Amino acid sequence: KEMEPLGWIHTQPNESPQLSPQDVTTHAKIMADNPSWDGEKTIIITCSFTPGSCTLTAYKLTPSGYEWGRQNTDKGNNPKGYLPSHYERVQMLLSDRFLGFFMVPAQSSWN
Amino acid sequence: HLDHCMHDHFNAEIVTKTIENKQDAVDYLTWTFLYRRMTQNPNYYNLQGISHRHLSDHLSELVEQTLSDLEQSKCISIEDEM
C-alpha cells in the first residue's frame, strides 16, 4: 500500500527484439481489470535468457497497445492487428545502492 | 532506560512539587537523557519520528501512563485531568 504497482517482470527463454503479443495482451488485460495500473507507469520487464547471461528489456504500453490488448482474444504468437507501436521501450537500469524484497503467497507457494 | 523505571522519580518530583501538573511532568522529562536520546535513536523508545509532534506525544503518553500508574496506585491525585 505504501508502493504503487509498476507493472511486472517475467523471464523469457530467449531474446526477442520485440515485446511478445502475449505480453501486451497480458499487460492490457491486467490494466483493463485493475484501475490501479496506470499505463504510463506500469511496465513489462523481460529477462530473456541469452547464452550464459540475461538480457533485460523494459517495455511500456502505448494507448494504442492497451486498447488492442484489451480487445484481443487470439492467444497465438501472431495475432491480428498487432503492431510494434503497441509498446515502447522504457529506460530501466540496475542498482547496488538499494535493495528490494519479495512477496510470496502465504498459504501455498508461487510455482 | 528511564521510561521503564520512571514512576519512582515522578512520584518524588511530585511530592517535591517540582511536577505540579502534567505539563511540568513533560517539562521535567525534558531535562533527562531520555529526551536527548529519543531524538537521536527514536526506535529504541518505540518512537516513529524525531518531530515535535512525535516527541511531544510520546512524552505525553509516557507521563500520562506513569501518572495513571501513580493515581491507580493512589500515590498521587490528578484533578482536572491536568
Binding site: 484501475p35 499505463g39 494507448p63 492497451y66 486498447e67 | 515535535h52 506525544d57 505525553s60 507521563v63 500520562e64
Partner: protein, 58 residues
Amino acid sequence: EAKPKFLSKAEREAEALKRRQQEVEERQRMLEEERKKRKQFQDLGRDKSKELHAIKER
C-alpha cells in the same frame, strides 16, 4: 517547536483521527486522480541556413 507540549490522550487520539482522516482523504484524492489519468490514457488510444553556412564557413 522546541519545548514539547503535553497533549491529553483524548486530544492525542483526536489529533490521530484528524491525521488519519487527512491521509485517507489524500488517498481518495490520489485514487480519483488515478482514475483521471486512467481515463486520459484510455481515450488517447480509443537563406537563413545559407547565412549560418556562411558564418560557419567564415
